[PDB]
Amino acid sequence: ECRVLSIQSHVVRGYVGNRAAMFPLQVLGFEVDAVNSVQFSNHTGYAHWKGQVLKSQELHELYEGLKVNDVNKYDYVLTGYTRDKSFLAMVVDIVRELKQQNSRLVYVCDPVMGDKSMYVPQDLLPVYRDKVVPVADIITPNQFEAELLSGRKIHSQEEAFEVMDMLHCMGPDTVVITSSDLPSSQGSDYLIALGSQRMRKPDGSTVTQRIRMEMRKVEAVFVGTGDLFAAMLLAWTHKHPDNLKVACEKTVSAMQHVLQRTIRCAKAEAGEGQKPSPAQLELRMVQSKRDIEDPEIVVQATVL
Amino acid sequence: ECRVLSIQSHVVRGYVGNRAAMFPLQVLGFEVDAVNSVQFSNHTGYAHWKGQVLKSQELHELYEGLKVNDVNKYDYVLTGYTRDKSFLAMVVDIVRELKQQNSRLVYVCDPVMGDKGSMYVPQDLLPVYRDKVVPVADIITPNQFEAELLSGRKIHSQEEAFEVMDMLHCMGPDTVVITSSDLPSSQGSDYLIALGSQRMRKPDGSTVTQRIRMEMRKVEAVFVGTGDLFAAMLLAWTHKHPDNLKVACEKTVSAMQHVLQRTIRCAKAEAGEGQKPSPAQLELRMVQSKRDIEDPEIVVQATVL
Ligand SMILES: Nc1ncnc2c1ncn2[C@@H]1O[C@H](COP(=O)(O)OP(=O)(O)OP(O)(O)=S)[C@@H](O)[C@H]1O
Ligand SMILES: Nc1ncnc2c1ncn2[C@@H]1O[C@H](COP(=O)(O)OP(=O)(O)OP(O)(O)=S)[C@@H](O)[C@H]1O
Ligand SMILES: C[C@H]1[C@H](OC(=O)CCC(=O)O)O[C@@H]2O[C@@]3(C)CC[C@H]4[C@H](C)CC[C@@H]1[C@@]24OO3
């Protein structure tokens, strides 16, 4: 009954892009139309990868194939890692058309550009800033990406929430900073994620719910975690459209279950005292099915 | 634990090929490496479609990317509808190498070539399925027409069907399931007949052939991707019951019945009362059938012959 248009990458092996997004959404009861932006043997963090990428016009052809059959009707649009601005532009056009057809459609966008350094071309920052985010309704930046989009560096929680208010003003009524460098109150092994939802009264007035979350840090580099986060937040905010606290609690708890199982299995595969390889660190998503369906709450968000 | 390499089609909307195979398998606890042989907006039963076809060379590159990283290691290989001889040939080469690395790899093949009388595959492929693919396959799920094509013998009776399936066993696969047939049922013209045959090697060294018949009630609609779902779920349940084709087929067929009944109900509801459901309204309701796929209640029982 709830259909999501997910335009993301495909990997033969592993869980990034649509591989990390469609399984949890399907298991949580969402219908998914998946446009695969690329097909690689595996994600680029491996020592090697081979495959091909889809051209923006090819994406357009697929969308028109759906349209002429009159099955271009969606409740959600979901996007993530992209390296070509033509593709982003086409995505924006599609989102505009669908929003003209459905006033209530929700565009969930993970604005993937960099972390801590930019790993996408610089000319994408303007596109995300001036074309994509303005038509987005939920965004899942990290601190670096929030700073790049806002043009202001974040040095404190207050500055972070002011940046998130700026991002709200740019478009999205829901903004989650997934990772940050702010200090946790439980020590160096816990990380901070902030959340802000701008809800609208019967008047034109704004009321912004703000939450802060601390989650333990797993000692490994994972790929696809942001795609999985964005998909599960889509699902849980759909279940809890006015309670960002609960949605984020469920999402982060599911993430923590998945990543804890993954790290344990990964160091099982590798020898004791051996750093697991990227191949050994692939998210154990199959084995996490139930955790994704009904996660045990292991994190508590503070409403501020 | 159990990793399946599934090389099949991908549709943006709907459930055919990998779309109809990866979700059940993932929900049944299998890890799935998915090579999408094509990407189309939707399957050919719609008014229109658009998409791209992956070339054999690209497939080879993807497999070589897996190989170069030393993660081309599998317990199962799953294939279905293909139209290019080059692609099929490449798939056979991959199966041969994987079997050289693991002698216990099981290749589940649906040799899709036609149905009813209509061949919807290039005639270039029948020689290839007969002489290269079926020989290295371990489980096949053809329909009556496809079994007749691979064997070259017309089937007029159940006994002749099991003879054809013995010939197919000789070609390679130790498990052969004919998924649909024109054979009359004993419960009404509205039931379909499916047959199964498994050669299993007793510890004595001798081999015994278990044979089974199944009657399933027909659903009055034309569905797409049924074969893909069937082969995937049969892979799963024969992994869980490697020596009891009866139970594996019972569970596969029960899941199928649940999915199809839910799909026709929801499609008739979406369309009007007295309205023919469209191909779009008859897309398999896979998500909403999750539980029935995870633990199907047995709605059909196979007759051991
Ligand atoms: N090592 C880790 N420890 C704990 N949580 C992690 C870890 N890696 C990823 N996460 C989780 O994944 C989410 C973010 O995904 P990331 O891969 O960190 O993406 P990012 O760094 O936020 O950049 P993205 O992809 O644009 S949001 C966080 O909210 C965490 O829940
Ligand atoms: N209309 C239907 N009514 C009941 N069961 C069906 C129907 N269509 C397909 N099935 C089930 O799907 C299975 C086989 O899928 P089919 O689409 O029939 O395969 P086929 O296309 O006849 O030959 P394939 O595709 O190469 S296995 C059957 O064994 C049935 O259980
Ligand atoms: C109409 C035919 C087209 O066929 C071509 O365009 C032939 C190009 C070529 O393979 O050289 O693509 C596909 O191909 C497969 C093998 C995958 C599944 C099908 C798609 C889901 C829909 C299109 C259909 C399809 O049929 O079966």
XYZ file of C-alpha atoms and ligand atoms in Angstrom:
698
model
C 0.000 0.000 0.000
C 3.031 2.233 0.610
C 5.280 2.308 -2.469
C 8.825 3.711 -2.447
C 10.850 4.720 -5.523
C 14.451 3.904 -4.551
C 17.107 5.075 -7.022
C 20.420 3.713 -5.761
C 23.350 1.475 -6.640
C 23.408 -2.303 -7.000
C 26.279 -4.576 -5.975
C 26.331 -8.257 -6.911
C 27.880 -9.121 -3.543
C 27.218 -7.106 -0.413
C 24.852 -4.477 0.935
C 25.135 -0.897 -0.301
C 22.616 1.310 -2.049
C 19.526 -0.628 -3.074
C 20.874 -3.889 -1.634
C 20.999 -2.239 1.798
C 17.669 -0.430 1.324
C 15.184 -2.736 -0.396
C 15.448 -5.806 1.844
C 14.661 -3.919 5.100
C 11.886 -1.894 3.441
C 10.317 -5.014 1.917
C 10.587 -6.839 5.246
C 8.967 -3.860 7.000
C 6.022 -4.095 4.600
C 6.862 -1.436 1.996
C 6.564 -2.021 -1.736
C 9.750 -0.916 -3.507
C 10.396 0.120 -7.113
C 14.187 -0.069 -7.413
C 16.146 1.778 -10.093
C 19.732 0.514 -9.928
C 22.052 3.417 -10.721
C 25.060 1.087 -11.155
C 25.914 -2.615 -11.100
C 29.318 -3.389 -9.571
C 30.711 -6.734 -8.452
C 31.070 -5.194 -4.966
C 31.522 -1.828 -3.291
C 34.541 0.365 -3.992
C 36.084 -0.216 -0.550
C 37.339 -3.591 -1.762
C 40.771 -3.879 -3.356
C 39.053 -4.200 -6.745
C 35.639 -3.687 -8.293
C 34.240 -4.113 -11.797
C 30.918 -3.181 -13.325
C 29.039 -0.465 -15.162
C 27.064 2.672 -14.340
C 23.699 3.752 -15.639
C 23.467 6.873 -17.716
C 21.075 9.553 -16.682
C 19.109 9.162 -19.868
C 18.764 5.437 -19.151
C 17.258 6.390 -15.839
C 14.925 8.625 -17.638
C 13.886 5.845 -19.961
C 12.997 3.604 -17.075
C 10.930 6.279 -15.402
C 9.061 6.917 -18.660
C 8.480 3.183 -19.013
C 6.705 3.320 -15.667
C 4.904 6.549 -16.601
C 3.377 5.464 -19.921
C 1.945 2.454 -18.071
C 0.520 4.913 -15.501
C 2.317 3.203 -12.612
C 4.550 6.180 -11.774
C 2.563 6.647 -8.549
C 4.517 6.701 -5.301
C 4.317 7.676 -1.653
C 8.097 8.009 -1.204
C 11.264 8.676 -3.181
C 14.637 7.536 -1.836
C 18.108 8.487 -3.064
C 21.686 8.251 -1.863
C 25.200 7.969 -3.261
C 25.652 9.571 -6.688
C 28.795 10.762 -8.466
C 27.297 12.410 -11.585
C 25.339 15.667 -11.521
C 23.287 14.708 -14.591
C 21.815 11.828 -12.586
C 21.033 14.139 -9.660
C 19.355 16.555 -11.985
C 17.172 13.862 -13.428
C 16.278 12.769 -9.976
C 15.195 16.298 -9.152
C 13.041 16.450 -12.291
C 11.371 13.135 -11.420
C 10.720 14.261 -7.845
C 9.198 17.520 -9.093
C 6.834 15.735 -11.475
C 5.749 13.195 -8.861
C 5.190 15.914 -6.257
C 3.018 17.746 -8.771
C 1.029 14.513 -9.096
C 0.974 13.750 -5.337
C 0.978 16.671 -2.903
C 1.861 14.360 0.003
C 4.845 12.512 -1.494
C 7.902 12.410 0.781
C 11.401 12.657 -0.711
C 14.036 11.075 1.550
C 17.533 12.157 0.495
C 20.890 11.114 1.915
C 23.215 13.902 0.624
C 26.354 11.790 0.283
C 29.408 13.955 -0.423
C 32.119 13.321 2.167
C 33.104 12.495 5.724
C 35.339 13.807 8.510
C 37.195 14.880 2.951
C 35.063 14.959 -0.197
C 34.800 11.641 -2.046
C 32.471 12.993 -4.753
C 33.201 15.716 -7.325
C 33.055 19.263 -6.000
C 30.525 20.382 -8.606
C 27.913 18.227 -6.825
C 27.828 20.442 -3.718
C 25.922 23.258 -5.505
C 23.487 20.748 -7.019
C 22.711 19.242 -3.619
C 22.517 22.705 -2.068
C 20.363 24.543 -4.605
C 18.412 21.822 -6.440
C 18.098 18.573 -4.462
C 17.734 19.576 -0.787
C 15.084 22.227 -1.565
C 12.772 19.468 -2.874
C 13.668 17.065 -0.047
C 11.480 16.361 2.981
C 13.866 14.187 5.035
C 17.666 14.439 4.856
C 20.297 12.337 6.632
C 23.558 14.313 6.382
C 26.591 13.725 8.523
C 28.205 16.721 10.221
C 30.618 17.328 7.332
C 27.774 17.312 4.808
C 25.608 19.551 6.997
C 28.475 22.056 7.173
C 29.060 21.896 3.414
C 25.364 22.474 2.699
C 24.940 25.284 5.237
C 28.272 27.018 4.634
C 28.842 27.159 8.407
C 31.129 24.951 10.479
C 29.712 23.222 13.556
C 31.634 23.511 16.830
C 28.855 22.986 19.398
C 25.460 21.362 19.808
C 23.874 24.821 19.627
C 25.685 25.544 16.362
C 24.593 22.124 15.097
C 20.922 22.848 15.764
C 21.238 26.300 14.182
C 22.726 24.655 11.080
C 19.805 22.218 11.131
C 17.383 25.153 11.309
C 19.128 26.606 8.252
C 18.682 23.268 6.480
C 15.006 23.237 7.480
C 14.716 26.682 5.895
C 16.300 25.289 2.726
C 13.478 22.733 2.492
C 13.358 19.529 4.539
C 11.059 19.579 7.562
C 13.053 16.645 9.010
C 16.837 16.739 9.435
C 18.975 14.064 11.102
C 22.714 14.573 11.508
C 23.831 10.958 11.649
C 27.338 11.343 12.860
C 29.129 14.186 14.513
C 32.261 15.111 16.337
C 30.516 16.575 19.376
C 31.504 15.188 22.732
C 29.493 12.427 24.212
C 28.727 12.455 27.870
C 29.587 8.754 28.185
C 33.162 8.992 26.880
C 35.095 8.646 23.631
C 33.514 5.433 22.637
C 30.044 6.831 22.118
C 28.896 9.063 19.285
C 26.373 11.779 18.912
C 23.590 12.050 16.411
C 21.201 14.956 16.513
C 17.618 15.213 15.071
C 15.203 18.056 14.342
C 11.655 17.918 12.977
C 9.872 21.141 12.003
C 6.149 20.464 12.413
C 3.452 22.891 11.308
C 0.532 24.095 13.433
C -2.886 24.951 11.951
C -1.405 28.432 11.684
C 1.688 29.104 9.610
C 3.714 28.776 12.802
C 6.656 26.399 13.193
C 7.357 24.081 16.134
C 10.694 22.260 15.997
C 11.133 19.096 18.050
C 14.824 18.504 18.796
C 16.436 15.275 19.993
C 19.920 14.178 20.711
C 21.147 10.486 20.602
C 24.260 8.667 21.946
C 25.169 5.282 20.481
C 28.192 3.128 20.972
C 30.874 3.188 18.362
C 31.746 -0.083 16.665
C 35.462 -0.306 15.876
C 35.394 -0.921 12.135
C 34.722 0.766 8.795
C 31.394 -0.279 7.266
C 29.942 0.520 3.837
C 26.226 0.950 3.191
C 25.371 2.011 6.741
C 23.959 5.366 5.631
C 21.759 3.747 2.987
C 20.386 1.306 5.576
C 19.873 4.152 8.060
C 17.952 6.260 5.548
C 15.717 3.354 4.504
C 14.845 2.369 8.070
C 14.222 5.987 9.084
C 11.853 6.269 6.124
C 9.951 3.256 7.451
C 9.847 4.279 11.112
C 8.948 7.931 10.475
C 6.144 6.628 8.268
C 4.957 4.670 11.299
C 5.632 7.664 13.607
C 5.113 10.765 11.442
C 4.946 13.135 14.445
C 7.423 11.443 16.845
C 10.980 11.729 15.531
C 12.194 10.475 18.920
C 10.588 7.038 18.549
C 11.421 6.686 14.851
C 15.086 7.487 15.449
C 15.248 5.203 18.491
C 13.997 2.264 16.424
C 16.265 3.113 13.484
C 19.450 3.463 15.542
C 18.667 0.365 17.613
C 18.254 -1.683 14.433
C 21.510 -0.214 13.104
C 23.278 -1.141 16.345
C 21.970 -4.712 16.238
C 23.030 -5.104 12.599
C 26.485 -3.616 13.186
C 27.112 -5.599 16.383
C 26.211 -8.884 14.693
C 28.316 -7.860 11.688
C 31.402 -7.007 13.748
C 31.168 -10.236 15.754
C 30.837 -12.395 12.632
C 33.599 -10.436 10.888
C 36.183 -11.003 13.603
C 35.049 -14.627 13.792
C 35.927 -15.042 10.107
C 39.290 -13.321 10.488
C 41.755 -14.774 12.956
C 41.925 -13.528 16.517
C 43.826 -10.249 16.557
C 43.428 -9.829 12.785
C 41.816 -6.749 11.266
C 38.788 -7.962 9.258
C 38.855 -7.171 5.553
C 36.127 -5.221 3.737
C 34.789 -8.524 2.383
C 34.526 -9.816 5.956
C 32.749 -6.641 7.155
C 29.715 -6.804 4.842
C 26.559 -6.072 6.821
C 24.969 -9.329 8.013
C 21.528 -8.192 6.899
C 19.916 -11.577 6.194
C 20.853 -12.761 9.684
C 19.483 -9.470 11.076
C 16.010 -9.790 9.519
C 14.101 -9.979 12.803
C 16.146 -7.175 14.371
C 15.129 -4.983 11.430
C 11.473 -5.984 11.826
C 11.078 -5.223 15.548
C 14.342 -4.031 17.096
C 14.896 -4.172 20.827
C 15.364 -0.592 22.006
C 19.023 -0.225 23.003
C 19.334 3.581 22.719
C 17.299 6.401 24.263
C 16.986 9.840 22.673
C 16.709 12.989 24.795
C 13.968 15.406 23.730
C 15.326 18.939 24.123
C 26.319 -19.970 5.751
C 24.611 -20.729 2.426
C 25.360 -18.335 -0.444
C 23.468 -18.416 -3.754
C 24.673 -16.781 -6.974
C 21.482 -15.800 -8.822
C 21.905 -14.520 -12.390
C 18.516 -13.260 -13.554
C 16.488 -10.302 -14.786
C 15.647 -7.176 -12.802
C 12.505 -5.061 -13.141
C 12.058 -1.661 -11.514
C 8.401 -2.463 -10.789
C 7.125 -5.966 -10.151
C 8.387 -9.452 -9.362
C 10.146 -11.462 -12.063
C 13.618 -12.949 -12.156
C 15.844 -11.785 -9.321
C 13.069 -9.583 -7.915
C 10.924 -12.695 -7.443
C 13.890 -14.797 -6.258
C 16.113 -12.739 -3.962
C 13.443 -11.618 -1.491
C 12.128 -15.127 -0.651
C 15.660 -16.562 -0.511
C 16.825 -13.712 1.729
C 13.757 -14.210 3.921
C 14.556 -17.948 4.072
C 18.035 -17.244 5.469
C 20.166 -17.485 2.317
C 22.767 -14.908 1.373
C 22.243 -13.944 -2.271
C 24.774 -12.506 -4.708
C 22.575 -11.081 -7.473
C 23.720 -10.473 -11.047
C 20.910 -8.646 -12.846
C 20.966 -9.971 -16.407
C 18.831 -6.993 -17.534
C 17.066 -3.939 -16.112
C 13.591 -3.108 -17.434
C 10.861 -0.816 -16.148
C 8.457 -3.777 -15.937
C 7.848 -7.129 -17.577
C 6.618 -7.594 -21.143
C 2.987 -8.218 -20.151
C 2.417 -4.495 -19.669
C 1.390 -2.260 -22.554
C 4.915 -0.827 -22.733
C 8.391 -1.362 -21.318
C 11.885 0.098 -21.498
C 15.264 -1.080 -20.298
C 18.759 -2.339 -20.986
C 20.369 -5.749 -21.461
C 23.626 -6.806 -19.852
C 26.127 -8.321 -22.223
C 27.945 -11.537 -21.628
C 31.238 -9.762 -21.388
C 29.899 -7.560 -18.645
C 28.740 -10.643 -16.811
C 32.131 -12.066 -17.185
C 33.597 -8.873 -15.761
C 31.359 -8.944 -12.801
C 32.268 -12.535 -12.070
C 35.960 -11.726 -12.551
C 35.576 -8.884 -10.065
C 34.245 -11.412 -7.574
C 37.095 -13.800 -8.451
C 39.893 -11.219 -8.179
C 38.694 -10.434 -4.645
C 38.571 -14.144 -3.725
C 34.844 -14.029 -2.943
C 33.593 -16.131 -5.869
C 32.699 -18.957 -3.474
C 29.165 -20.331 -3.469
C 26.993 -23.228 -2.380
C 24.311 -22.634 -5.036
C 23.871 -21.154 -8.510
C 20.401 -20.083 -9.678
C 19.461 -19.192 -13.259
C 16.293 -18.752 -15.287
C 15.102 -16.852 -18.350
C 17.901 -15.926 -20.766
C 17.711 -15.163 -24.487
C 21.390 -14.907 -25.524
C 23.435 -18.017 -26.287
C 26.594 -16.121 -25.306
C 25.142 -15.363 -21.867
C 24.111 -18.995 -21.331
C 27.496 -20.164 -22.399
C 29.167 -17.865 -19.939
C 26.932 -19.084 -17.193
C 27.924 -22.658 -17.939
C 31.616 -21.729 -17.783
C 31.070 -20.056 -14.408
C 29.250 -23.122 -13.076
C 32.069 -25.384 -14.276
C 34.762 -23.330 -12.546
C 32.752 -23.000 -9.325
C 32.187 -26.763 -9.305
C 35.914 -27.317 -9.789
C 36.447 -25.223 -6.649
C 33.590 -26.841 -4.661
C 32.494 -30.337 -5.672
C 29.296 -29.870 -3.621
C 27.889 -26.866 -5.514
C 24.271 -27.312 -6.638
C 23.162 -25.586 -9.855
C 19.396 -24.991 -9.887
C 18.287 -24.231 -13.453
C 14.911 -23.329 -14.865
C 15.316 -23.951 -18.520
C 12.895 -21.363 -19.729
C 12.101 -21.840 -23.438
C 8.303 -21.841 -23.851
C 4.940 -22.998 -22.571
C 1.564 -24.491 -23.597
C 2.427 -24.129 -28.189
C 4.732 -21.120 -27.974
C 8.530 -20.953 -27.760
C 9.474 -17.594 -26.384
C 13.208 -18.084 -26.641
C 15.581 -18.116 -29.638
C 15.825 -21.598 -31.134
C 19.598 -21.153 -30.797
C 19.160 -21.939 -27.089
C 17.537 -25.394 -27.121
C 20.781 -27.046 -28.334
C 22.639 -25.038 -25.687
C 20.292 -25.998 -22.849
C 20.371 -29.631 -23.960
C 24.115 -30.039 -24.532
C 25.767 -27.592 -22.100
C 23.435 -26.320 -19.361
C 21.355 -29.325 -18.293
C 24.508 -31.524 -18.220
C 26.046 -29.385 -15.437
C 22.725 -28.717 -13.674
C 21.732 -30.541 -10.490
C 18.091 -29.412 -10.113
C 15.855 -28.427 -13.038
C 12.293 -27.228 -13.072
C 10.946 -27.396 -16.565
C 7.383 -27.381 -17.628
C 5.873 -30.149 -19.789
C 6.715 -28.378 -23.053
C 10.265 -27.731 -21.971
C 10.766 -31.301 -20.818
C 9.517 -32.474 -24.219
C 11.938 -30.056 -25.899
C 14.971 -31.150 -23.866
C 14.102 -34.839 -24.272
C 12.723 -34.687 -27.815
C 9.761 -36.894 -26.858
C 6.097 -35.931 -26.755
C 4.319 -36.593 -23.453
C 0.803 -38.033 -23.658
C 0.637 -39.762 -20.258
C 2.028 -39.570 -16.738
C 4.086 -42.727 -17.321
C 5.666 -41.202 -20.429
C 6.285 -38.040 -18.398
C 8.305 -40.018 -15.856
C 10.174 -41.722 -18.712
C 11.069 -38.284 -20.096
C 12.191 -37.247 -16.616
C 14.414 -40.335 -16.379
C 16.057 -39.284 -19.645
C 16.551 -35.831 -18.119
C 18.115 -37.456 -15.049
C 20.518 -39.222 -17.402
C 21.428 -35.897 -19.014
C 22.543 -34.556 -15.628
C 20.155 -33.222 -12.985
C 19.580 -35.602 -10.088
C 16.342 -33.739 -9.244
C 13.732 -33.007 -11.923
C 10.397 -31.282 -11.309
C 7.846 -30.750 -14.072
C 5.938 -27.727 -12.833
C 2.957 -27.739 -15.047
C 1.387 -30.137 -17.441
C -1.639 -30.860 -19.531
C -2.168 -34.205 -17.791
C -5.724 -34.661 -16.471
C -6.309 -34.555 -12.791
C -8.633 -36.792 -10.901
C -10.211 -33.927 -8.922
C -11.420 -31.634 -11.724
C -10.214 -29.922 -14.877
C -9.516 -27.029 -12.593
C -6.515 -28.677 -11.030
C -3.026 -28.722 -12.354
C -0.659 -31.624 -12.266
C 3.004 -31.333 -11.309
C 5.488 -34.198 -11.007
C 8.806 -34.724 -9.271
C 11.664 -37.205 -9.474
C 14.869 -37.407 -7.427
C 17.759 -39.835 -7.878
C 19.425 -40.353 -4.490
C 22.376 -42.639 -3.760
C 21.769 -44.918 -0.771
C 24.894 -45.473 1.375
C 24.916 -49.011 -0.044
C 26.188 -47.493 -3.288
C 22.912 -48.244 -5.059
C 20.617 -45.427 -6.172
C 16.846 -45.141 -5.749
C 14.499 -42.808 -7.633
C 11.794 -41.172 -5.524
C 8.793 -40.088 -7.615
C 5.857 -37.872 -6.647
C 2.697 -36.335 -8.116
C 1.026 -33.062 -6.956
C -2.410 -31.627 -7.853
C -2.875 -27.933 -7.307
C -5.923 -25.846 -7.894
C -5.575 -23.444 -10.761
C -5.888 -19.764 -10.194
C -7.729 -18.032 -12.967
C -5.275 -15.388 -14.054
C -2.058 -15.111 -15.871
C 0.879 -14.415 -13.622
C 4.449 -13.533 -14.482
C 7.494 -14.626 -12.515
C 5.854 -17.718 -11.074
C 8.580 -19.918 -12.352
C 11.294 -17.821 -10.792
C 9.601 -17.822 -7.381
C 9.037 -21.547 -7.659
C 12.627 -22.389 -8.467
C 13.967 -20.141 -5.697
C 11.693 -21.608 -3.022
C 12.418 -25.140 -4.257
C 16.131 -24.398 -3.891
C 15.477 -23.354 -0.299
C 13.272 -26.289 0.691
C 15.447 -28.923 -1.001
C 18.372 -27.463 0.921
C 16.323 -27.975 4.088
C 15.184 -31.486 3.000
C 17.856 -32.835 0.637
C 16.477 -36.406 0.749
C 12.696 -35.735 0.824
C 11.535 -34.250 -2.477
C 7.958 -34.813 -1.282
C 8.206 -32.352 1.616
C 10.286 -29.790 -0.285
C 7.741 -29.745 -3.110
C 4.799 -29.639 -0.691
C 6.207 -26.542 1.013
C 7.149 -24.884 -2.289
C 3.710 -25.442 -3.713
C 1.925 -24.338 -0.595
C 3.842 -21.053 -0.536
C 2.996 -20.612 -4.151
C -0.658 -21.137 -3.525
C -0.754 -18.677 -0.723
C 1.008 -16.000 -2.786
C -1.191 -16.529 -5.803
C -4.444 -16.578 -3.893
C -3.570 -13.361 -2.055
C -2.550 -11.830 -5.389
C -5.775 -12.709 -7.216
C -7.848 -11.507 -4.253
C -6.077 -8.139 -4.072
C -6.132 -7.762 -7.871
C -9.866 -8.476 -8.083
C -10.361 -5.929 -5.299
C -8.244 -3.271 -7.033
C -10.146 -3.842 -10.262
C -13.914 -3.536 -10.200
C -16.404 -6.287 -9.493
C -16.670 -8.218 -12.743
C -13.505 -6.575 -14.103
C -10.536 -8.372 -15.625
C -7.498 -7.512 -13.458
C -4.738 -5.859 -15.462
C -1.170 -7.185 -15.682
C -0.221 -4.378 -13.287
C -2.847 -5.380 -10.714
C -1.711 -9.030 -10.906
C 1.885 -8.403 -9.800
C 2.767 -10.963 -7.141
C 2.066 -9.687 -3.617
C 5.440 -10.893 -2.375
C 5.926 -8.441 0.498
C 2.453 -9.087 1.919
C 3.074 -12.855 1.673
C 6.350 -12.769 3.642
C 5.112 -14.986 6.479
C 3.473 -17.504 4.136
C 6.851 -17.786 2.403
C 8.726 -18.162 5.702
C 6.563 -20.997 7.079
C 3.929 -22.138 4.575
C 1.062 -24.153 5.989
C 0.715 -27.278 3.864
C -2.281 -26.869 1.537
C -1.248 -29.646 -0.890
C 0.098 -33.148 -0.256
C 2.152 -35.010 -2.845
C 1.403 -38.644 -3.670
C 4.517 -40.817 -3.460
C 4.589 -43.230 -6.399
N 31.454 2.481 13.204
C 30.207 2.788 13.507
N 29.772 2.746 14.744
C 28.536 3.041 15.063
N 27.652 3.407 14.183
C 27.969 3.498 12.911
C 29.284 3.187 12.485
N 29.318 3.355 11.191
C 28.120 3.742 10.806
N 27.341 3.856 11.846
C 25.938 4.193 11.824
O 25.603 4.580 10.523
C 24.990 5.831 10.495
C 25.636 6.721 9.493
O 26.129 6.026 8.393
P 27.548 6.389 7.941
O 28.162 5.373 7.141
O 28.239 6.877 9.105
O 27.319 7.602 7.012
P 27.847 8.985 7.484
O 29.222 8.933 7.960
O 26.834 9.545 8.348
O 27.786 9.578 6.040
P 26.484 9.416 5.184
O 26.562 8.166 4.526
O 26.308 10.505 4.115
S 24.971 9.708 6.477
C 25.189 6.418 11.853
O 24.058 7.103 12.297
C 25.455 5.247 12.734
O 24.272 4.699 13.313
N -2.413 -19.865 -12.775
C -1.820 -20.617 -11.858
N -2.498 -21.286 -10.960
C -1.927 -22.034 -10.048
N -0.636 -22.188 -9.954
C 0.170 -21.575 -10.799
C -0.387 -20.741 -11.818
N 0.611 -20.259 -12.511
C 1.716 -20.751 -11.988
N 1.454 -21.533 -10.971
C 2.455 -22.198 -10.147
O 3.701 -21.889 -10.683
C 4.421 -23.058 -10.925
C 5.213 -22.995 -12.198
O 5.355 -21.713 -12.698
P 5.013 -21.535 -14.177
O 4.886 -20.135 -14.527
O 3.878 -22.402 -14.389
O 6.233 -22.150 -14.886
P 5.976 -22.285 -16.400
O 6.238 -20.923 -16.879
O 4.770 -23.057 -16.678
O 7.225 -23.006 -16.926
P 8.499 -22.346 -16.330
O 8.159 -20.826 -16.178
O 9.630 -22.472 -17.199
S 8.801 -23.291 -14.577
C 3.408 -24.162 -10.971
O 3.908 -25.380 -10.486
C 2.307 -23.681 -10.109
O 2.427 -24.076 -8.755
C 11.505 -8.409 -24.814
C 12.552 -8.973 -23.863
C 13.872 -8.241 -24.008
O 14.547 -8.831 -25.118
C 15.457 -8.102 -25.785
O 15.411 -6.906 -25.892
C 16.523 -8.981 -26.364
C 17.901 -8.356 -26.314
C 19.008 -9.372 -26.286
O 18.961 -10.148 -25.231
O 19.858 -9.464 -27.146
O 14.668 -8.346 -22.836
C 14.508 -9.262 -21.743
O 15.422 -10.285 -21.949
C 15.169 -11.402 -21.085
C 16.297 -12.384 -21.293
C 15.021 -10.927 -19.644
C 13.575 -10.710 -19.198
C 12.638 -9.872 -20.075
C 12.381 -8.483 -19.457
C 11.859 -8.563 -18.025
C 11.417 -7.691 -20.342
C 11.884 -7.601 -21.789
C 12.100 -8.989 -22.403
C 13.090 -9.788 -21.547
O 13.009 -11.140 -22.098
O 14.011 -12.083 -21.548
